[PDB]
Amino acid sequence: TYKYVNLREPSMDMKSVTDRAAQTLLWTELIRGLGMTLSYLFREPATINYPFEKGPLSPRFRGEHALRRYPSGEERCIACKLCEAVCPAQAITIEAEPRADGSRRTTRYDIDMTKCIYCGFCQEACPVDAIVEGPNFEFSTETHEELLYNKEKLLNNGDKWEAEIAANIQADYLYR
Amino acid sequence: TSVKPIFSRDMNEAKRRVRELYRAWYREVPNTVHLFQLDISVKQGRDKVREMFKKNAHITDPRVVDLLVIKGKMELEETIKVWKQRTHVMRFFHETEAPRPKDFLSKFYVGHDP
Amino acid sequence: RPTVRPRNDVAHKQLSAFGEYVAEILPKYVQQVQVSCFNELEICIHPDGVIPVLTFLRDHSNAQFKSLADLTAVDIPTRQNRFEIVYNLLSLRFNSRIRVKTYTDELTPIESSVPVYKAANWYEREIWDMFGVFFANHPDLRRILTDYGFEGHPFRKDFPLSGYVELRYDDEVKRVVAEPVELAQEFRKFDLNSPWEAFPAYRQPP
Amino acid sequence: LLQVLKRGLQQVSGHGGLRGYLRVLFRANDVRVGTLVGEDKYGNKYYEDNKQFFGRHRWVIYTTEMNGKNTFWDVDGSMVPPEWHRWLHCMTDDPPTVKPPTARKFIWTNHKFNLSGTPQQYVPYSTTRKKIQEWVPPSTPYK
Amino acid sequence: GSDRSRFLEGKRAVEDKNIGPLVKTIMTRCIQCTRCIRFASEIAGVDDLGTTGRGNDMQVGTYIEKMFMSELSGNIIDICPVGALTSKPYAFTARPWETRKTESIDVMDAVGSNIVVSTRTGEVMRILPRMHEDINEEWISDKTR
Amino acid sequence: QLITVDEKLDITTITGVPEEHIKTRKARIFVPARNNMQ
Amino acid sequence: GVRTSPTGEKVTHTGQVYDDGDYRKVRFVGRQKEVNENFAIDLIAEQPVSQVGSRVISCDGGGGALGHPRVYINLDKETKTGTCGYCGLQFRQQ
Amino acid sequence: GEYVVAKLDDLINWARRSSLWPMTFGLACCAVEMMHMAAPRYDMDRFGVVFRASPRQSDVMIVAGTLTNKMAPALRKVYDQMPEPRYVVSMGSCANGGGYYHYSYSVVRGCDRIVPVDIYVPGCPPTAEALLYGILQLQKKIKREKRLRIWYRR
Amino acid sequence: ASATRFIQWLRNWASGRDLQAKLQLRYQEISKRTQPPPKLPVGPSHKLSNNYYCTRDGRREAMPPSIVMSSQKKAVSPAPPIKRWELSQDEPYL
Amino acid sequence: SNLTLNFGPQHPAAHGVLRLVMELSGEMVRKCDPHIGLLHRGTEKLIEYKTYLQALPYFDRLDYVSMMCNEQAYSLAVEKLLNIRPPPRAQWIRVLFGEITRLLNHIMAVTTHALDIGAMTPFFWMFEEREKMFEFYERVSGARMHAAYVRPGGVHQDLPLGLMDDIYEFSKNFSLRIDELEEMLTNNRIWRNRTVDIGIVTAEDALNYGFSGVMLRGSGIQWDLRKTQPYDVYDQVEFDVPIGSRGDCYDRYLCRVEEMRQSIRIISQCLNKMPPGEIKVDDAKVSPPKRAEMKTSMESLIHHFKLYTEGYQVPPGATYTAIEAPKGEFGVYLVSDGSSRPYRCKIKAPGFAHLAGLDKMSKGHMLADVVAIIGTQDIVFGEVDR
Numbered sequence A: 001t002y003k004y005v006n007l008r009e010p011s012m013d014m015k016s017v018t019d020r021a022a023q024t025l026l027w028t029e030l031i032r033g034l035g036m037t038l039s040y041l042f043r044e045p046a047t048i049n050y051p052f053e054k055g056p057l058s059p060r061f062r063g064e065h066a067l068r069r070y071p072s073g074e075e076r077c078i079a080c081k082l083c084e085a086v087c088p089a090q091a092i093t094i095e096a097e098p099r100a101d102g103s104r105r106t107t108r109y110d111i112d113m114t115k116c117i118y119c120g121f122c123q124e125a126c127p128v129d130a131i132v133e134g135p136n137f138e139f140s141t142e143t144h145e146e147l148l149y150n151k152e153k154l155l156n157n158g159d160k161w162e163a164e165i166a167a168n169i170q171a172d173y174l175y176r
Numbered sequence B: 001t002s003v004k005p006i007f008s009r010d011m012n013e014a015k016r017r018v019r020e021l022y023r024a025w026y027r028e029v030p031n032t033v034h035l036f037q038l039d040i041s042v043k044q045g046r047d048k049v050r051e052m053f054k055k056n057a058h059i060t061d062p063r064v065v066d067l068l069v070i071k072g073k074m075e076l077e078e079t080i081k082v083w084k085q086r087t088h089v090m091r092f093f094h095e096t097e098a099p100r101p102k103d104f105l106s107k108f109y110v111g112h113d114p
Numbered sequence C: 001r002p003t004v005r006p007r008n009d010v011a012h013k014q015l016s017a018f019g020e021y022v023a024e025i026l027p028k029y030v031q032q033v034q035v036s037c038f039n040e041l042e043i044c045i046h047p048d049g050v051i052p053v054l055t056f057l058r059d060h061s062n063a064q065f066k067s068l069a070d071l072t073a074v075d076i077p078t079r080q081n082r083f084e085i086v087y088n089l090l091s092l093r094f095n096s097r098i099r100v101k102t103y104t105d106e107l108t109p110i111e112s113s114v115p116v117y118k119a120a121n122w123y124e125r126e127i128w129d130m131f132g133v134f135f136a137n138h139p140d141l142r143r144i145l146t147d148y149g150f151e152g153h154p155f156r157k158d159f160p161l162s163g164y165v166e167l168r169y170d171d172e173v174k175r176v177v178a179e180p181v182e183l184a185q186e187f188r189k190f191d192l193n194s195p196w197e198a199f200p201a202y203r204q205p206p
Numbered sequence D: 001l002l003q004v005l006k007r008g009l010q011q012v013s014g015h016g017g018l019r020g021y022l023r024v025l026f027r028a029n030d031v032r033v034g035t036l037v038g039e040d041k042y043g044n045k046y047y048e049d050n051k052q053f054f055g056r057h058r059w060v061i062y063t064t065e066m067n068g069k070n071t072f073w074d075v076d077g078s079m080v081p082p083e084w085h086r087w088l089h090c091m092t093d094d095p096p097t098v099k100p101p102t103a104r105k106f107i108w109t110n111h112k113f114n115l116s117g118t119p120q121q122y123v124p125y126s127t128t129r130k131k132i133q134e135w136v137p138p139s140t141p142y143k
Numbered sequence E: 001g002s003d004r005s006r007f008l009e010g011k012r013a014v015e016d017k018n019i020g021p022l023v024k025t026i027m028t029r030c031i032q033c034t035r036c037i038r039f040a041s042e043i044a045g046v047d048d049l050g051t052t053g054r055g056n057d058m059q060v061g062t063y064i065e066k067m068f069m070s071e072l073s074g075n076i077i078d079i080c081p082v083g084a085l086t087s088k089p090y091a092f093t094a095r096p097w098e099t100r101k102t103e104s105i106d107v108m109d110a111v112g113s114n115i116v117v118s119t120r121t122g123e124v125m126r127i128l129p130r131m132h133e134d135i136n137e138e139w140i141s142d143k144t145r
Numbered sequence F: 001q002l003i004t005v006d007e008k009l010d011i012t013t014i015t016g017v018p019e020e021h022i023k024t025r026k027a028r029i030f031v032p033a034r035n036n037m038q
Numbered sequence G: 001g002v003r004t005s006p007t008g009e010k011v012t013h014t015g016q017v018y019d020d021g022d023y024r025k026v027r028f029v030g031r032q033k034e035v036n037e038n039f040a041i042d043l044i045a046e047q048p049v050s051q052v053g054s055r056v057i058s059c060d061g062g063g064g065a066l067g068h069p070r071v072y073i074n075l076d077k078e079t080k081t082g083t084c085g086y087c088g089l090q091f092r093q094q
Numbered sequence H: 001g002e003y004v005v006a007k008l009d010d011l012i013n014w015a016r017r018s019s020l021w022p023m024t025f026g027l028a029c030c031a032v033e034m035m036h037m038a039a040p041r042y043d044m045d046r047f048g049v050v051f052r053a054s055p056r057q058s059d060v061m062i063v064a065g066t067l068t069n070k071m072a073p074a075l076r077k078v079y080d081q082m083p084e085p086r087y088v089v090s091m092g093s094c095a096n097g098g099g100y101y102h103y104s105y106s107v108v109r110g111c112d113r114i115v116p117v118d119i120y121v122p123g124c125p126p127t128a129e130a131l132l133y134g135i136l137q138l139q140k141k142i143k144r145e146k147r148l149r150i151w152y153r154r
Numbered sequence I: 001a002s003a004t005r006f007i008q009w010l011r012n013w014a015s016g017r018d019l020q021a022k023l024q025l026r027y028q029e030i031s032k033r034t035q036p037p038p039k040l041p042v043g044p045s046h047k048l049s050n051n052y053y054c055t056r057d058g059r060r061e062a063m064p065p066s067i068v069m070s071s072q073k074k075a076v077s078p079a080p081p082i083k084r085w086e087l088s089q090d091e092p093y094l
Numbered sequence J: 001s002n003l004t005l006n007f008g009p010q011h012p013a014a015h016g017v018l019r020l021v022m023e024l025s026g027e028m029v030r031k032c033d034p035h036i037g038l039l040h041r042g043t044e045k046l047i048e049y050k051t052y053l054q055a056l057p058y059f060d061r062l063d064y065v066s067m068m069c070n071e072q073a074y075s076l077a078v079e080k081l082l083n084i085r086p087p088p089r090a091q092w093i094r095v096l097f098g099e100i101t102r103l104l105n106h107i108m109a110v111t112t113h114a115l116d117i118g119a120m121t122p123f124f125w126m127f128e129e130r131e132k133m134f135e136f137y138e139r140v141s142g143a144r145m146h147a148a149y150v151r152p153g154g155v156h157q158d159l160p161l162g163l164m165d166d167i168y169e170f171s172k173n174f175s176l177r178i179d180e181l182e183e184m185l186t187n188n189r190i191w192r193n194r195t196v197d198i199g200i201v202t203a204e205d206a207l208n209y210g211f212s213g214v215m216l217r218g219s220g221i222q223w224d225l226r227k228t229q230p231y232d233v234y235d236q237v238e239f240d241v242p243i244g245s246r247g248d249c250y251d252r253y254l255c256r257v258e259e260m261r262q263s264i265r266i267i268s269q270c271l272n273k274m275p276p277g278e279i280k281v282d283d284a285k286v287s288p289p290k291r292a293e294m295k296t297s298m299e300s301l302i303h304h305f306k307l308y309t310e311g312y313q314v315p316p317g318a319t320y321t322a323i324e325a326p327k328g329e330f331g332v333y334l335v336s337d338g339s340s341r342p343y344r345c346k347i348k349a350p351g352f353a354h355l356a357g358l359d360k361m362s363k364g365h366m367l368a369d370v371v372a373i374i375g376t377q378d379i380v381f382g383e384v385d386r
């Protein structure tokens, strides 16, 4: 099924011809356009007062990465490298060895935040909710080097944001 | 050993195109030095043209020669029409590359590469 | 069966019949005709047949493939003719798609199909740029995607992913320069293939 | 038109007089009056007004001092602590005064804002130990 | 196999066995294939491994506390189809998909066993056997490994 | 019409590869050994 | 369990620290070395051993689907506790 | 003496951070989020950041998208023609360091190989709000400048 | 929402519409930002019997292409001619 | 005389950068030679080093105004090679967000076309609508643009509770926003002077030059892949295909405005016909299992482990799959060699053939018209250069 967007015959009766001459000489359709912009002048603007007001986001939002812990304080990550395998940008670098207590834990966990595409595949792949993308999006820096996160930075991000991260996961985990 | 030609049916036909392309490049160099305000001289530019031609002097396949001329003409068209910029022209001279060691001892000192 | 893609035997039969039709009319050029299990018709032809076959498919009243959807190439280094040229055509009259494939190597040119489809102009420039296949009698054959002065044909399987050179700005010469590529982090090659066969239906004879 | 002017006057009174009214005008470029939802431990004050359209219905008046930094004029979004970050960005409807976050012993008690460009900025380094151990020659001339 | 489970019960769990510093045993992963038993008896000529118990409780091991320290012992890591027997030195250090394989030769003796050297990011991660029917078949000695 | 070429096929000059990565490289042609772990 | 080396640089939970003659510690001059202070190895050691009745116990890390894959732990050995391979919690048969 | 130089620095710093005219290099998808920062919800004009600015009238360059080798000389040329003071904001992973295309043969692995960068805005793309946070962060960087203080002590 | 009645009339007259009925700014008609938890359904392969994977294995039902002609009567078209489209009855002409 | 157009306008623009080398005689344009590749990022080569899942985000970044539509095209191609079928609810979600994406694209196409011609104001009004649609993207995927939401097998997650109500509230008011846009442009004599009889292309030429989408329908060709070669559940919704009569910029503008109205009409049916059920194919050898299953069932954990490391293997074969993307026919020629990584992935960008026709369409026009013709083609150089 189709329709014509511009297949109309203008009437050639005198009344219709004089309607078009009036539009040509008196700029009626231009005046109409001025009416529309005038009405907007008197509308409330859509602008918000950033940084005092913020754009709305959802629990699923993919922001700055963080490494999480169990309630006891033990790290969740057990160096399985599923996140490193799936990462589409090869942004993750991991090394691991047996910890002094025998645990399977990483000795390196780097995310090059300038390689990362913020896709969230790592947190999908993680089997123990260890690597997540947090809600923070205001972490721009003055140097490139500050965006090459190592494990200490990511663990500090986890300890910094866990209060929000845990609530957001509580809100969305039944959709996963 | 029966193949579809590109342009030239034998080496003699192919070498005619090579000489025609060299003529065009040879005459273009003075204009290139002026248009791009290059700090190199016309002699340096023409020496570069000779070096690029010489490195392929050992070819004996007329089809390979045709492709080399096809590519050389494309490169000339980029230069004449000023689709290239100054950086593209100067990429033939590798000015910021430090000379790499040639003899066995120099290579031995600096790494494992042959 | 909810998870399995349903078959369409009617279209498989129609495309098979039209495949024989084309082979009967162009025996000088047609080498193979196949219909995939998801109902796509491919005509494999000798490279000399590009213009006759494409012209026939465009102009024949039972074909009318007036629209060139896509023209591309595939590099298979193990083949004597490593390059496979693929034409994806569309017929609005018969609401159908056909695929025409031929082959070439590094030194053998292919006839330009610009006379049949004006759409081919840039597609062939891209194939020349990315694969180094030369198209004879092309009005304006030159690179289209790569940088000026770029050496090599990046879509060849033996061209390295990161190339051979990289750019930076150099203050001493006050311009962007090109130097041999060095990576702070080498791309990490992964061996993913399972050592166990997945699809018995495609097993090749020993 | 007179009722609009009254609401204009109400905002001056609603910000504790002219001095408080001018302070918020110059700090926040906004003189609206909202309901106080709560104040965090750093001094940020959170307000809501659900008659405003979505986006302007919640806001924070940043504290004038945080972690030893004078933030009277210099404020930024990283000053909002995580428990309020969720409410302010409408990721949830309940503020931390009604749905407090779960307490864990490892969670930062003190939020930190973006520290880039300061002496507390993050500096990357390799967290792994040396791989290849070199032979140490004997410290005696037995040769 | 299928793509899902219909097992609604609790799982079995078995205690681990210490058999030396080279082979770590996580015997809950064992699928009772008896490859290690047959290798130890036939290839290595050491009748130390067997099965104790019966039925679902059948357990592969040594029964008593014993070490399987033979010059060919490390080969049971390769033949164990599962992660029940794993290299202790290698533990947790790498995943297979990320290693680069260099096919090379062993120089620890004069046999010349064919090996694969697994490397990652410029580091040697482990040594594996490489099949060669006329030399080492598909085994290596523990010094080589 | 076809021509006759008896030269050995060589495309080194038209591949764009730097000379260093043609003349000093050693290619290894092999069938990969089975991963002994599987 | 942070500790400072003789030069004053903190050692991380992975044991990393630039040695005396390592120029690379120049990157921290005028800035700082990011070190997480909550060493997981020390925190998991503070958890009490859980006393259970059965020979076999299961752990999923707590929180149901928000924990780790559920594994079963054998507690027959009396010389040691059963340790969860995911979260490090310890169990003992009473 | 020092008091007069201190206040003059404040005045000129205030004027410059209050009138930041950006030249946007809309290279790829990051430019879309840049347009949303100009759109009504954020209205960067309300901070004094004008919508339409000519490269020769610009104070800040925003690199919003992937920088290819083919494009790198042209970007440098525009930067070189910018009158000073001039600042560069790198927006998004591609501009920051190559991003998804880091290992491509045709891509510059970060625009900071071509021009000095003042602010790196992370994300793929950064949200319009994250970009606005970065611009506000550049303003506070300008606020900390002490050009006349340094000159006085020369 | 809070425009004076006079301003509502002015912008309604200037635009020629009833703007107040379709404001572009969102108020309280939108969904709550906290929702009750979902309980999502499971697919048709979630069964305890009569569910052998080999009966629902789409990947293994794919076959190599049928070879119609290899170099190893009525005419036909690739499909029947397409049927002429019908004019919209909802609104044929704009 | 020879002249080079600037890379981009002096206001924010998100189409990419173009080097247009032109030959002029007086006011008239005699030759147009677009020089592209300024956003060539070797996407097609990078995909060969990715698993099928890892390559999916690359399609968000092609026509980065039509993200989920590009995801749909790639997903359909892999589903065809896999010989599997996404569940009905996922198909409805894909059509629903496909049309929301069409609205996103057509706002950008129409309003930036106007903005470059000098009509700045509509861009601001309609980008507030785009901002609200970005919120729908963010609520289903967590990202405003590059959602990576539509995947082979279905979609990544089910709609959150309350989302469909919000999509209804948005859709309820959108036609009024279109009307305001038409009030500014449709009957404006300046707008008509800039577009009417500009860039005329005949039906015959449009076909031979490889055009698609509105570039065909503006010339009267009755063709739309959603009608003629339907995919997902497009055969279950009612809508009209707008057709032009003059084949010029003005008719193509009218076609795009009317297509926005039809997209609202389709969205309305999607909101009412949304079925219950799972949102990705119930085959764990293709689609990963639910997280609760992965943490409880041995089979689920294995399949989760393998799908996120090796990825699923795709049977060997080649397909050309195309959709009616907002900019035209968007297709992929996808070659599988039997492994978990594609052997070759050629991307057919509708703007590639459209831009190749710029020289043909600009003949006999003035310099200022070249801007109008580029706008009417709706060119984004992520898909042109790839």
Ligand code: SF4
Pocket (backbone or CB within 6 Å): A083, A086, A087, A088, A089, A090, A091, A092, A111, A115, A116, A117, A118, A119, A120, A121, A122, A123, A133
């Ligand atoms: S978000 Fe995506 S690109 Fe970034 S680290 Fe995770 S998997 Fe890699």
Ligand code: SF4
Pocket (backbone or CB within 6 Å): A076, A077, A078, A079, A080, A081, A082, A083, A084, A094, A122, A125, A126, A127, A128, A129, A130, A131
């Ligand atoms: S973060 Fe998760 S997926 Fe990545 S290595 Fe650790 S446990 Fe595995």
Ligand code: SF4
Pocket (backbone or CB within 6 Å): E029, E030, E031, E032, E033, E034, E035, E036, E037, E060, E079, E080, E081, E082, E084, E085
């Ligand atoms: S080889 Fe491994 S799986 Fe087989 S019986 Fe021995 S320990 Fe068990």
Ligand code: SF4
Pocket (backbone or CB within 6 Å): E029, E081, E082, E083, E084, J302
């Ligand atoms: S990797 Fe193999 S042996 Fe190890 S737990 Fe998984 S299925 Fe068992």
Ligand code: SF4
Pocket (backbone or CB within 6 Å): H028, H029, H030, H031, H064, H065, H066, H091, H092, H093, H094, H095, H099, H100, H123, H124, H125, H126, J061, J064
């Ligand atoms: S960083 Fe992401 S959004 Fe920005 S240009 Fe690159 S791919 Fe596009």
Ligand SMILES: [K+]
Pocket (backbone or CB within 6 Å): E076, E077, E078, E079, E080, E081, E082, E083, E084, E085, E086
């Ligand atoms: K093993």
Ligand SMILES: [Zn+2]
Pocket (backbone or CB within 6 Å): G059, G060, G061, G062, G068, G084, G085, G086, G087, G088, G089
């Ligand atoms: Zn546990």
